[PDB]
Scaffold this active site. Structure first.
Site, PDB file in Angstrom:
ATOM      1  N   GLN A  16      18.759  29.584  36.607  1.00 30.32           N
ATOM      2  CA  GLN A  16      19.873  29.845  35.671  1.00 30.32           C
ATOM      3  C   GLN A  16      19.450  30.767  34.528  1.00 30.32           C
ATOM      4  OE1 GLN A  16      23.115  29.039  35.785  1.00 30.32           O
ATOM      5  NE2 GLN A  16      22.730  27.762  37.631  1.00 30.32           N
TER       6      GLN A  16
ATOM      7  N   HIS B 229      17.845  19.961  38.351  1.00 27.02           N
ATOM      8  CA  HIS B 229      18.529  20.206  39.592  1.00 27.02           C
ATOM      9  C   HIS B 229      17.769  19.541  40.757  1.00 27.02           C
ATOM     10  CE1 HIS B 229      20.039  22.560  43.015  1.00 27.02           C
ATOM     11  NE2 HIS B 229      21.024  23.026  42.265  1.00 27.02           N
TER      12      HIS B 229
ATOM     13  N   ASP C  59      11.498  26.400  36.893  1.00 24.32           N
ATOM     14  CA  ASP C  59      12.681  26.690  37.626  1.00 24.32           C
ATOM     15  C   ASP C  59      13.574  27.565  36.796  1.00 24.32           C
ATOM     16  OD1 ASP C  59      15.142  26.729  38.928  1.00 24.32           O
ATOM     17  OD2 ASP C  59      15.429  24.571  39.132  1.00 24.32           O
TER      18      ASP C  59
ATOM     19  N   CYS D   9      24.710  19.045  41.645  1.00 26.92           N
ATOM     20  CA  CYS D   9      23.347  18.850  42.212  1.00 26.92           C
ATOM     21  C   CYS D   9      22.417  18.308  41.145  1.00 26.92           C
ATOM     22  CB  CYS D   9      22.755  20.107  42.961  1.00 26.92           C
ATOM     23  SG  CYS D   9      23.673  20.558  44.410  1.00 26.92           S
TER      24      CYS D   9
ATOM     25  N   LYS E 136      22.222  34.488  42.268  1.00 30.06           N
ATOM     26  CA  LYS E 136      22.618  34.208  40.910  1.00 30.06           C
ATOM     27  C   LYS E 136      22.456  35.336  39.892  1.00 30.06           C
ATOM     28  CE  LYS E 136      22.355  29.197  41.300  1.00 30.06           C
ATOM     29  NZ  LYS E 136      21.652  27.985  40.769  1.00 30.06           N
TER      30      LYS E 136
END
Ligand SMILES: *Cc1c(COP(=O)(O)O)cnc(C)c1O
Ligand SMILES: *Cc1c(COP(=O)(O)O)cnc(C)c1O
Lengths: 422, 422
Positions: A210, A130, A207, A373, A233
């Site tokens: 998600q 991303h 990261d 993105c 999220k």
């Protein structure tokens, strides 16, 4: 029967009733929300608790002498603890931020100012990152002088174990490795422990934006140095994120931002800093967003987060199965059990925006089209495409309050779209 | 009769009813909330609108890909317009941030990275600055090499017109001037037009965090280059702030944070940036916070912002005159009509934290004690003090939902402390 191996029809029915947006109709069809990878829908009981906090328990926090300021301060630190318990961290290793994006920026800048990431050190990231875990590194390399290198993906966008081991031959001693815990385009959950052992001396950042919402994360088992994620999220408020770091590493890091609370002593000419975690919280934080996030985590743990994870897992397997049966779609990412949460795809002969437009107007189905993105990833996927690749994709993503029926509506929609463009 | 020259008893009592915190009782006493300078209480109708947004019109923004995404985009962007109109700015000149503190940090890093504030250059600030508009300058001057200079305050903390002129004799051409609109300790509203005309070629930044909540600010008329403020101090959500900058200057600034949406094109090796204002909004912003702040602005405008301003003026003048009557308190700041919103003071022979505690536990009165994130100013006030100065003060601060009767409860509590404790 809603077709769950995880939840009774009553528990599941109760869950769906927690999300009022699900009662919305688009042109007379119920909302089928499959854009979870962009953001999630909000729980009424969580939001009511934030409302009660804003209206009855609110003031600015720390240095609390009056009654509301004590209440607000206690609630905020209680929230920090709920997040620490959720990740198996200690509370002083949890820093509240504005989001994943801010977290990554915090790390790049703080690593460089602290003298850990130097000119001509190398930062290794992956080709499927991303923009949030790509653009800061690539742009800031121009100011601080470090180099950026990539673990390469295959022509379906997969980061294989072999690619990881091969990169280590070529980039043997990266100063920093920053990688996604799970791609927002391929759906691939990454082999974080294999990465941690392969690049044993690197500062390892994950990261988690998600991954954290649907899968158990234990930062001590993974042995990551830093992890970031975003509240919005995981059913949470906007404007709130989390940065986890190893206490021993955080203690040596220059603060990213400066201002109130994060200081100890300030004179006209010099400053010293507060202890952890307050060192890395400059000025008034998103006090109610943090408290709200805490209440979101309480909600998930009341359902039971292992059930959340299993439910999303079974939805994911069903989505990927049904998508793979359609002869008029091209699917990206691994076709294996690493693929979770979402499916990025193209309908042969149909522009991605038309797919999302017709799904939404004619079937009430929310999906997203475009580069998601991850512009450089699109160029990788183009090489393996067998169609006229539009340099973008459609994406359907599942979460807690989704059903197999939602997925069946998506499939019915796509068939319709194929018959309409012929 | 509630003793307002501004609101009828009817209107005033409807305004009070908007804030449910005011029904709280502390050991049988009604809440007398006078810590507005820390943060403000929340309006129920505003928070209900935020609730309706979160539950029924929520998604991620800026791509017209489905129905909720478009709704959420329109709501967020209309909120940006509401802020622009409130300050008399264009909407491309309004950037959403996490708060005033992030805003100053943005400016310092961005001015340095952009080549505007260099090693040769001086930034001029004042001795009365909050840590948010002091610490980032001082700390980053050690990484970037610029110099920091100070407009001096007198021994009561007053910045006189003559001190501003005297600084101009030693530092005639500061590259950057960053100054408070109104001090959070002395209450002094600064003469921004004087500063603008005296340093006409500097980049002028105003920290408006105390000012914007209660006084009309027309950024075009003032001719400031940048202005920052925080939502939570103007009845708004936490985690949301505003940065205003002149279009011609924003267009030349390197972005502070990098990630999604702020880019236009991304490759593995290079990036280009999106148009204003998105160039400066990296990743998902505090969507609901911005919407909430818009609705807060709507609310203040439905009351009448000029009335808000005159009500706070009438309250400020009553507070200051009643405090001036008390022979056992030492008052800080200017004793003239530049003093608004708040009064910092000490009670002779009583530590500030005890004053605050007794006021809270016996009179329901919320005040703050400590350094108020202005430790250098504390050192300034120490030299003018006639008591044993505790390197901190008590502060009482008024806003819209406060009354002359609230102030009278404060005064009664202060006399109780004097008379009995002692
Ligand atoms: C959403 C997401 C981000 C960025 O999150 P923000 O909350 O928009 O800052 C980063 N990485 C991945 C993989 C994501 O899915
Ligand atoms: C409150 C305040 C700040 C900091 O605001 P945050 O919302 O804590 O970032 C800066 N300046 C002044 C004058 C203030 O009153």
């Amino acid at each position: 029967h809603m077709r769950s191996t995880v939840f009774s029809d009553e528990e599941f029915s109760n869950i769906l009733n927690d999300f009022p947006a699900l009662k919305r109709n688009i042109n007379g069809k119920r909302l089928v929300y499959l854009d979870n990878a962009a953001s999630t829908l909000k729980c009424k009981s969580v939001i009511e608790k934030m409302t009660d906090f804003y209206l009855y328990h609110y003031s600015n926090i720390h240095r609390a002498v009056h009654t509301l300021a004590s209440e607000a301060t206690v609630a905020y630190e209680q929230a920090r603890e709920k997040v620490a318990n959720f990740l198996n961290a200690s509370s002083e290793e949890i820093i509240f931020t504005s989001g994943t994006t801010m977290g990554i920026n915090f790390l790049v800048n703080s690593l460089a100012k602290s003298g850990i990431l130097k000119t001509e050190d190398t930062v290794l990231i992956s080709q499927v990152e991303h923009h949030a875990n790509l653009v800061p590194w690539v742009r800031l390399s121009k100011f601080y002088g470090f180099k950026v290198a990539y673990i390469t993906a295959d022509e379906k966008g997969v980061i294989t174990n072999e690619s990881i081991l091969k990169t280590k031959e070529s980039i043997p001693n990266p100063k920093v490795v920053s990688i996604t815990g799970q791609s927002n385009v391929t759906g691939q959950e990454m082999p974080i422990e294999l990465i941690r052992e392969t690049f044993k001396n690197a500062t390892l950042i994950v990261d988690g934006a998600q991954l954290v919402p649907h899968k158990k994360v234990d930062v001590k088992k993974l042995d990551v140095d830093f992890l970031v994620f975003s509240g919005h999220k995981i059913l949470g408020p906007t404007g709130i994120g989390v940065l986890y770091g190893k206490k021993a590493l955080l203690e040596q890091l220059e603060p990213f931002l400066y201002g109130g609370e994060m200081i100890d002593k300030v004179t006209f000419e010099d400053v010293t800093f507060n202890v952890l975690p307050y060192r890395f919280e400059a000025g008034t934080q998103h006090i109610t967003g943090a408290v709200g996030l805490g209440y979101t985590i309480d909600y998930l743990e009341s359902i039971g987060f292992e059930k959340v994870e299993k439910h999303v897992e079974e939805l994911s397997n069903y989505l990927l199965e049904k998508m793979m049966e359609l002869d008029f779609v091209e699917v990206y990412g691994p076709i294996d059990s690493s693929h979770k949460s979402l499916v990025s795809f193209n309908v042969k002969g149909v522009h991605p925006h038309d797919v999302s437009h017709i799904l939404d107007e004619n079937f009430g189905v929310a999906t997203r089209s475009g580069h998601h993105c991850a512009q450089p990833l699109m160029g990788v996927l183009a090489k393996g495409s067998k169609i006229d690749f539009p340099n973008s994709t459609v994406r359907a993503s599942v979460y807690l309050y989704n059903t197999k029926e939602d997925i069946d509506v998506l499939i019915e929609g796509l068939k319709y779209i194929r018959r309409w463009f012929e």
